[PDB]
Amino acid sequence: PAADAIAKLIIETTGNLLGYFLLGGFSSAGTIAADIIMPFLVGTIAAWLQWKNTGRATELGWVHYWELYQQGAETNSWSLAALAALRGGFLVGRSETV
Amino acid sequence: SSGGGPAVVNNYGDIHTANYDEFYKGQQRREAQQQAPILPVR
């Protein structure tokens, strides 16, 4: 959301488009725009966090399962706590003894 | 000799000594083998 929140996508993009329009970008392509394509890139800019567990890889070896996608209890909180989201994701597929 | 005693009880099958606990555990193990790989990791 820090990159493509709907409030940003509306306000900032319409302001940039209006500035481009008043400068005359749509009359002729000479003008240089300033982020008038933000709604086209929703969910693409810094939308993920990938962490490889080096200790787990060292413990497992050459043959291992690669990766897992983990959805948190709160769907839109990883951007607030990147480290907590990664640790909660790594809580899942660990060595287990009972 | 064999026909008409324990040797035909064996043909009868699980009429004499046979417990429910390991039978239920084996059924659960077979179902777990069937369903565990397809259960999601979440």
Coordinates of N, CA, C and O in Angstrom, one line a residue:
Chain A
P1 N 0.8 -1.2 0.0 CA 0.0 0.0 0.0 C 0.8 1.3 0.0 O 0.3 2.3 -0.4
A2 N 2.1 1.2 0.5 CA 2.9 2.4 0.5 C 3.2 2.9 -0.9 O 3.7 4.0 -1.1
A3 N 3.0 2.1 -2.0 CA 3.3 2.5 -3.3 C 2.0 2.7 -4.2 O 2.0 3.6 -5.0
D4 N 1.0 1.9 -4.0 CA -0.2 1.9 -4.8 C -1.5 1.9 -4.0 O -2.4 1.1 -4.3
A5 N -1.5 2.6 -2.9 CA -2.8 2.8 -2.2 C -3.8 3.5 -3.1 O -3.4 4.3 -4.0
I6 N -5.1 3.3 -2.9 CA -6.1 3.8 -3.8 C -6.1 5.4 -3.6 O -6.4 6.1 -4.6
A7 N -5.9 5.9 -2.4 CA -5.8 7.3 -2.2 C -4.7 7.9 -3.0 O -4.9 9.0 -3.7
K8 N -3.5 7.3 -3.0 CA -2.4 7.8 -3.9 C -2.8 7.7 -5.4 O -2.7 8.7 -6.1
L9 N -3.3 6.5 -5.8 CA -3.7 6.3 -7.2 C -4.7 7.3 -7.7 O -4.7 7.6 -8.9
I10 N -5.6 7.8 -6.8 CA -6.5 8.8 -7.2 C -5.8 10.2 -7.2 O -5.6 10.8 -8.3
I11 N -5.4 10.6 -6.0 CA -5.1 12.0 -5.9 C -3.8 12.3 -6.6 O -3.7 13.3 -7.4
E12 N -2.7 11.6 -6.3 CA -1.4 11.9 -6.9 C -1.4 11.8 -8.4 O -0.8 12.6 -9.1
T13 N -2.0 10.7 -8.9 CA -2.0 10.5 -10.3 C -2.9 11.5 -11.0 O -2.5 12.0 -12.1
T14 N -4.0 11.9 -10.5 CA -4.8 12.9 -11.1 C -4.1 14.3 -11.1 O -4.2 15.1 -12.1
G15 N -3.4 14.6 -10.0 CA -2.6 15.8 -10.0 C -1.5 15.8 -11.0 O -1.3 16.8 -11.7
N16 N -0.8 14.7 -11.1 CA 0.3 14.6 -12.1 C -0.2 14.7 -13.5 O 0.4 15.4 -14.4
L17 N -1.4 14.1 -13.8 CA -2.0 14.1 -15.1 C -2.4 15.6 -15.4 O -2.3 16.0 -16.5
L18 N -3.0 16.3 -14.4 CA -3.4 17.6 -14.7 C -2.2 18.5 -14.9 O -2.3 19.4 -15.7
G19 N -1.1 18.3 -14.2 CA 0.1 19.1 -14.4 C 0.7 18.8 -15.8 O 1.1 19.8 -16.5
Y20 N 0.7 17.6 -16.3 CA 1.1 17.2 -17.6 C 0.2 17.9 -18.6 O 0.7 18.4 -19.6
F21 N -1.1 17.9 -18.4 CA -2.1 18.5 -19.3 C -1.9 20.0 -19.4 O -1.9 20.5 -20.5
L22 N -1.7 20.6 -18.3 CA -1.5 22.1 -18.3 C -0.2 22.5 -18.9 O -0.1 23.5 -19.6
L23 N 0.9 21.6 -18.8 CA 2.1 21.9 -19.5 C 2.0 21.6 -21.0 O 2.8 22.1 -21.8
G24 N 1.0 20.8 -21.4 CA 0.8 20.5 -22.8 C 1.3 19.2 -23.3 O 1.6 19.0 -24.5
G25 N 1.4 18.2 -22.4 CA 1.9 16.9 -22.8 C 1.0 16.2 -23.8 O 1.5 15.5 -24.7
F26 N -0.3 16.3 -23.6 CA -1.2 15.6 -24.5 C -1.4 16.4 -25.8 O -1.9 15.8 -26.8
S27 N -1.0 17.6 -25.9 CA -1.0 18.4 -27.2 C 0.2 17.9 -28.0 O 0.0 17.7 -29.2
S28 N 1.3 17.7 -27.4 CA 2.5 17.2 -28.1 C 3.4 16.5 -27.1 O 3.5 16.9 -25.9
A29 N 4.0 15.4 -27.5 CA 4.7 14.4 -26.6 C 6.0 15.0 -26.1 O 6.8 14.3 -25.4
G30 N 6.4 16.3 -26.3 CA 7.7 16.8 -25.9 C 7.8 16.8 -24.4 O 8.9 16.6 -23.8
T31 N 6.7 17.1 -23.6 CA 6.8 17.3 -22.2 C 7.2 16.0 -21.5 O 6.8 14.9 -21.9
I32 N 8.0 16.1 -20.4 CA 8.4 15.0 -19.6 C 7.5 14.8 -18.5 O 7.2 15.8 -17.7
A33 N 6.9 13.7 -18.4 CA 5.9 13.4 -17.3 C 6.5 13.0 -16.0 O 7.7 12.7 -15.9
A34 N 5.7 13.1 -14.9 CA 6.1 12.7 -13.6 C 5.1 11.8 -13.0 O 4.2 12.2 -12.3
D35 N 5.3 10.5 -13.2 CA 4.5 9.4 -12.6 C 3.0 9.6 -12.9 O 2.2 9.8 -12.0
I36 N 2.7 9.5 -14.2 CA 1.3 9.5 -14.7 C 0.8 8.1 -15.0 O -0.3 7.9 -15.5
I37 N 1.6 7.1 -14.7 CA 1.3 5.7 -15.0 C 1.2 4.8 -13.7 O 1.2 3.6 -13.8
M38 N 1.1 5.5 -12.5 CA 1.0 4.7 -11.3 C -0.2 3.7 -11.3 O 0.0 2.6 -10.8
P39 N -1.4 4.0 -11.8 CA -2.4 3.0 -11.7 C -2.2 1.8 -12.6 O -2.8 0.7 -12.4
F40 N -1.2 1.9 -13.5 CA -0.9 0.7 -14.4 C 0.0 -0.3 -13.7 O 0.1 -1.4 -14.1
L41 N 0.6 0.1 -12.5 CA 1.6 -0.8 -11.9 C 1.1 -1.1 -10.4 O 1.9 -1.0 -9.5
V42 N -0.1 -1.5 -10.3 CA -0.7 -1.8 -9.0 C -0.3 -3.2 -8.6 O -0.6 -4.2 -9.4
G43 N 0.4 -3.4 -7.5 CA 0.8 -4.7 -7.1 C 2.1 -5.2 -7.7 O 2.4 -6.4 -7.6
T44 N 2.9 -4.3 -8.3 CA 4.2 -4.7 -8.9 C 5.4 -4.1 -8.3 O 6.5 -4.7 -8.4
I45 N 5.3 -2.9 -7.6 CA 6.5 -2.2 -7.1 C 6.6 -2.6 -5.6 O 5.8 -2.3 -4.8
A46 N 7.7 -3.4 -5.3 CA 8.1 -3.8 -4.0 C 6.9 -4.5 -3.3 O 6.6 -4.3 -2.1
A47 N 6.2 -5.3 -4.0 CA 5.0 -6.0 -3.5 C 5.3 -7.3 -2.8 O 4.3 -7.9 -2.3
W48 N 6.5 -7.7 -2.7 CA 6.9 -9.0 -2.1 C 8.1 -8.9 -1.2 O 8.8 -7.9 -1.3
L49 N 8.2 -9.9 -0.4 CA 9.4 -10.0 0.5 C 9.8 -11.5 0.4 O 9.0 -12.4 0.8
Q50 N 11.0 -11.8 -0.1 CA 11.5 -13.2 -0.2 C 12.7 -13.3 0.7 O 13.6 -12.5 0.6
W51 N 12.7 -14.3 1.6 CA 13.8 -14.6 2.5 C 14.2 -16.0 2.3 O 13.3 -16.9 2.5
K52 N 15.5 -16.3 2.1 CA 16.0 -17.6 2.1 C 16.7 -17.9 3.4 O 17.6 -17.2 3.8
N53 N 16.2 -19.0 4.1 CA 16.8 -19.3 5.4 C 18.1 -20.0 5.3 O 18.1 -21.2 4.9
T54 N 19.2 -19.3 5.5 CA 20.5 -19.9 5.3 C 20.8 -21.0 6.2 O 21.4 -22.0 5.8
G55 N 20.4 -20.9 7.5 CA 20.6 -21.9 8.4 C 19.8 -23.2 8.1 O 20.3 -24.3 8.2
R56 N 18.6 -23.0 7.6 CA 17.8 -24.1 7.2 C 18.4 -24.8 6.0 O 18.4 -26.1 5.9
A57 N 18.9 -24.0 5.0 CA 19.5 -24.6 3.8 C 20.8 -25.4 4.2 O 21.0 -26.5 3.7
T58 N 21.6 -24.9 5.2 CA 22.8 -25.5 5.6 C 22.4 -26.8 6.3 O 23.1 -27.9 6.1
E59 N 21.3 -26.8 7.1 CA 20.9 -28.0 7.8 C 20.4 -29.1 6.9 O 20.5 -30.3 7.1
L60 N 19.7 -28.6 5.8 CA 19.0 -29.6 4.9 C 19.9 -30.2 3.9 O 19.9 -31.4 3.7
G61 N 20.7 -29.4 3.1 CA 21.6 -29.9 2.2 C 21.3 -29.6 0.7 O 20.5 -28.7 0.4
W62 N 21.8 -30.5 -0.1 CA 21.7 -30.3 -1.6 C 20.3 -30.5 -2.1 O 19.8 -29.7 -2.9
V63 N 19.6 -31.6 -1.6 CA 18.3 -31.9 -2.0 C 17.3 -31.3 -0.9 O 17.4 -31.7 0.3
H64 N 16.4 -30.4 -1.3 CA 15.5 -29.7 -0.4 C 14.4 -29.1 -1.1 O 14.4 -28.9 -2.3
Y65 N 13.3 -28.9 -0.4 CA 12.2 -28.1 -1.0 C 12.6 -26.6 -1.0 O 13.2 -26.1 -0.1
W66 N 12.1 -25.9 -2.0 CA 12.7 -24.6 -2.3 C 12.0 -23.5 -1.5 O 12.7 -22.9 -0.6
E67 N 10.7 -23.3 -1.7 CA 10.1 -22.1 -1.2 C 8.7 -22.3 -0.9 O 8.1 -23.3 -1.3
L68 N 8.1 -21.4 -0.2 CA 6.7 -21.5 0.2 C 6.1 -20.1 0.3 O 6.8 -19.2 0.9
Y69 N 4.9 -19.9 -0.2 CA 4.2 -18.6 0.0 C 3.4 -18.6 1.3 O 2.6 -19.6 1.5
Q70 N 3.5 -17.6 2.1 CA 2.8 -17.6 3.4 C 2.0 -16.3 3.4 O 2.5 -15.2 3.2
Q71 N 0.7 -16.5 3.8 CA -0.2 -15.4 4.0 C -0.4 -15.2 5.5 O -0.8 -16.2 6.2
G72 N -0.2 -14.0 5.9 CA -0.3 -13.7 7.4 C -1.7 -13.7 7.9 O -2.7 -13.7 7.1
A73 N -1.9 -13.7 9.2 CA -3.2 -13.6 9.8 C -3.9 -12.3 9.4 O -5.1 -12.2 9.1
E74 N -3.1 -11.2 9.4 CA -3.6 -9.9 8.8 C -3.0 -9.8 7.4 O -1.8 -9.8 7.3
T75 N -3.9 -9.6 6.4 CA -3.4 -9.7 5.0 C -2.6 -8.5 4.6 O -1.7 -8.6 3.7
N76 N -2.7 -7.3 5.3 CA -2.0 -6.1 4.8 C -1.2 -5.5 6.0 O -1.3 -4.3 6.3
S77 N -0.4 -6.3 6.6 CA 0.4 -5.9 7.7 C 1.9 -6.1 7.5 O 2.7 -5.6 8.3
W78 N 2.3 -6.9 6.5 CA 3.7 -7.2 6.3 C 4.5 -5.9 6.0 O 5.7 -5.8 6.3
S79 N 3.9 -5.0 5.3 CA 4.5 -3.7 5.0 C 4.7 -2.9 6.3 O 5.7 -2.1 6.4
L80 N 3.9 -3.1 7.3 CA 4.1 -2.5 8.6 C 5.2 -3.1 9.4 O 6.0 -2.4 10.0
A81 N 5.3 -4.5 9.3 CA 6.3 -5.2 10.0 C 6.9 -6.3 9.1 O 6.4 -7.4 9.1
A82 N 7.9 -5.9 8.3 CA 8.5 -6.8 7.4 C 9.1 -8.0 8.1 O 9.0 -9.2 7.7
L83 N 9.9 -7.7 9.2 CA 10.6 -8.7 9.9 C 9.6 -9.7 10.6 O 9.8 -10.9 10.5
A84 N 8.6 -9.2 11.2 CA 7.6 -10.0 11.9 C 6.9 -10.9 10.9 O 6.6 -12.1 11.1
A85 N 6.6 -10.4 9.7 CA 5.9 -11.2 8.7 C 6.8 -12.3 8.2 O 6.4 -13.5 8.1
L86 N 8.1 -12.1 8.0 CA 9.0 -13.1 7.6 C 9.2 -14.2 8.7 O 9.2 -15.4 8.4
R87 N 9.3 -13.8 9.9 CA 9.4 -14.7 11.0 C 8.2 -15.6 11.1 O 8.2 -16.8 11.4
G88 N 7.0 -14.9 11.0 CA 5.8 -15.7 11.1 C 5.6 -16.7 9.9 O 5.1 -17.7 10.1
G89 N 6.1 -16.3 8.7 CA 6.2 -17.2 7.6 C 7.1 -18.4 7.8 O 6.8 -19.5 7.5
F90 N 8.3 -18.1 8.4 CA 9.2 -19.2 8.7 C 8.8 -20.0 9.9 O 9.4 -21.1 10.2
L91 N 7.7 -19.6 10.6 CA 7.2 -20.4 11.7 C 6.6 -21.8 11.2 O 6.4 -22.7 12.0
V92 N 6.3 -21.9 9.9 CA 5.5 -23.0 9.4 C 6.3 -24.2 9.1 O 6.1 -25.3 9.8
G93 N 7.3 -24.2 8.2 CA 7.9 -25.4 7.8 C 9.2 -25.7 8.4 O 10.3 -25.7 7.8
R94 N 9.2 -26.0 9.7 CA 10.4 -26.1 10.5 C 10.6 -27.6 11.0 O 9.7 -28.4 10.9
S95 N 11.7 -27.9 11.6 CA 12.0 -29.2 12.2 C 11.0 -29.3 13.4 O 10.8 -28.4 14.2
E96 N 10.4 -30.5 13.5 CA 9.3 -30.8 14.5 C 9.6 -32.0 15.2 O 9.9 -33.1 14.6
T97 N 9.6 -32.0 16.5 CA 9.7 -33.2 17.4 C 8.5 -33.2 18.4 O 8.3 -32.1 19.0
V98 N 7.8 -34.3 18.5 CA 6.8 -34.4 19.4 C 6.9 -35.8 20.1 O 7.2 -36.8 19.5
Chain B
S1 N -9.2 -83.3 12.4 CA -8.5 -82.6 13.4 C -8.5 -81.1 13.2 O -9.1 -80.4 14.0
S2 N -7.9 -80.7 12.1 CA -7.9 -79.2 11.8 C -9.3 -78.7 11.5 O -9.7 -77.7 11.9
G3 N -10.1 -79.5 10.7 CA -11.4 -79.1 10.3 C -12.4 -79.3 11.5 O -12.7 -80.4 11.9
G4 N -12.8 -78.1 12.0 CA -13.7 -78.1 13.2 C -13.2 -77.6 14.5 O -13.8 -77.9 15.5
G5 N -12.1 -76.9 14.5 CA -11.5 -76.4 15.7 C -10.9 -75.0 15.5 O -11.4 -74.1 14.8
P6 N -9.7 -74.7 16.1 CA -9.0 -73.5 15.9 C -8.6 -73.3 14.4 O -8.5 -72.2 13.9
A7 N -8.3 -74.4 13.7 CA -7.9 -74.3 12.3 C -9.0 -73.8 11.4 O -8.8 -73.2 10.3
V8 N -10.3 -74.0 11.8 CA -11.4 -73.5 11.1 C -11.8 -72.1 11.7 O -12.5 -71.3 11.0
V9 N -11.5 -71.9 13.0 CA -11.6 -70.5 13.5 C -10.8 -69.5 12.7 O -11.2 -68.4 12.5
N10 N -9.6 -70.0 12.3 CA -8.8 -69.1 11.5 C -9.5 -68.8 10.1 O -9.3 -67.7 9.6
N11 N -10.2 -69.8 9.6 CA -11.0 -69.5 8.4 C -12.1 -68.6 8.7 O -12.4 -67.7 7.9
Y12 N -12.8 -68.7 9.8 CA -13.8 -67.8 10.3 C -13.3 -66.4 10.2 O -13.9 -65.5 9.7
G13 N -12.1 -66.2 10.9 CA -11.5 -64.9 10.8 C -11.9 -63.9 11.9 O -13.1 -63.7 12.1
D14 N -10.9 -63.4 12.7 CA -11.1 -62.5 13.8 C -12.4 -62.7 14.6 O -13.0 -61.7 15.1
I15 N -12.7 -64.0 14.9 CA -13.8 -64.3 15.8 C -13.3 -64.3 17.2 O -13.9 -63.7 18.2
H16 N -12.2 -65.1 17.4 CA -11.4 -65.1 18.6 C -10.4 -64.0 18.6 O -10.6 -63.0 17.8
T17 N -9.3 -64.0 19.3 CA -8.4 -62.9 19.6 C -8.3 -62.0 18.5 O -7.7 -62.3 17.4
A18 N -8.7 -60.7 18.7 CA -8.6 -59.6 17.7 C -9.1 -58.4 18.4 O -10.2 -58.3 18.9
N19 N -8.2 -57.3 18.4 CA -8.5 -56.1 19.2 C -8.9 -55.0 18.2 O -8.7 -55.0 17.0
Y20 N -9.6 -54.0 18.8 CA -10.1 -52.9 18.0 C -9.1 -51.8 17.8 O -9.1 -51.0 16.9
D21 N -8.2 -51.7 18.8 CA -7.3 -50.5 18.9 C -6.4 -50.5 17.7 O -6.3 -49.4 17.0
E22 N -5.7 -51.6 17.4 CA -4.7 -51.5 16.3 C -5.4 -51.5 14.9 O -4.9 -50.9 14.0
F23 N -6.6 -52.1 14.9 CA -7.4 -52.0 13.6 C -7.8 -50.5 13.3 O -7.7 -50.1 12.2
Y24 N -8.3 -49.8 14.3 CA -8.6 -48.4 14.2 C -7.4 -47.6 13.8 O -7.4 -46.7 13.0
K25 N -6.3 -47.9 14.5 CA -5.0 -47.2 14.2 C -4.5 -47.4 12.8 O -4.0 -46.5 12.2
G26 N -4.7 -48.7 12.3 CA -4.3 -49.0 11.0 C -5.1 -48.3 9.9 O -4.7 -47.8 8.9
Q27 N -6.5 -48.3 10.2 CA -7.3 -47.5 9.3 C -7.0 -46.0 9.3 O -7.0 -45.4 8.2
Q28 N -6.7 -45.5 10.5 CA -6.3 -44.1 10.5 C -5.0 -43.8 9.8 O -4.8 -42.8 9.1
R29 N -4.0 -44.8 9.9 CA -2.8 -44.7 9.2 C -3.0 -44.7 7.7 O -2.3 -44.0 7.0
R30 N -3.8 -45.6 7.2 CA -4.1 -45.7 5.8 C -4.7 -44.4 5.3 O -4.4 -43.8 4.2
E31 N -5.7 -43.9 6.0 CA -6.3 -42.6 5.6 C -5.3 -41.4 5.7 O -5.4 -40.6 4.8
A32 N -4.4 -41.4 6.7 CA -3.4 -40.4 6.8 C -2.4 -40.5 5.6 O -2.0 -39.5 5.1
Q33 N -2.1 -41.7 5.2 CA -1.3 -41.9 4.0 C -2.0 -41.4 2.8 O -1.3 -40.7 1.9
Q34 N -3.3 -41.6 2.7 CA -4.0 -41.1 1.5 C -4.1 -39.6 1.4 O -3.9 -39.0 0.4
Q35 N -4.4 -39.0 2.6 CA -4.7 -37.6 2.6 C -3.6 -36.6 3.0 O -3.8 -35.4 2.7
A36 N -2.6 -37.1 3.7 CA -1.6 -36.2 4.2 C -0.8 -35.4 3.1 O -0.7 -34.2 3.2
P37 N -0.4 -36.0 2.0 CA 0.4 -35.3 0.9 C -0.5 -34.2 0.3 O 0.1 -33.1 -0.1
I38 N -1.8 -34.4 0.2 CA -2.6 -33.4 -0.5 C -3.2 -32.3 0.5 O -3.8 -31.4 0.0
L39 N -2.9 -32.5 1.8 CA -3.3 -31.4 2.7 C -2.4 -30.2 2.6 O -1.2 -30.4 2.5
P40 N -2.9 -29.0 2.5 CA -2.1 -27.8 2.4 C -1.2 -27.6 3.6 O -1.4 -28.1 4.7
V41 N -0.1 -26.9 3.3 CA 0.9 -26.6 4.4 C 0.4 -25.5 5.3 O 1.0 -25.3 6.4
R42 N -0.5 -24.7 4.9 CA -1.0 -23.5 5.7 C -1.5 -24.0 7.0 O -0.8 -23.9 8.0

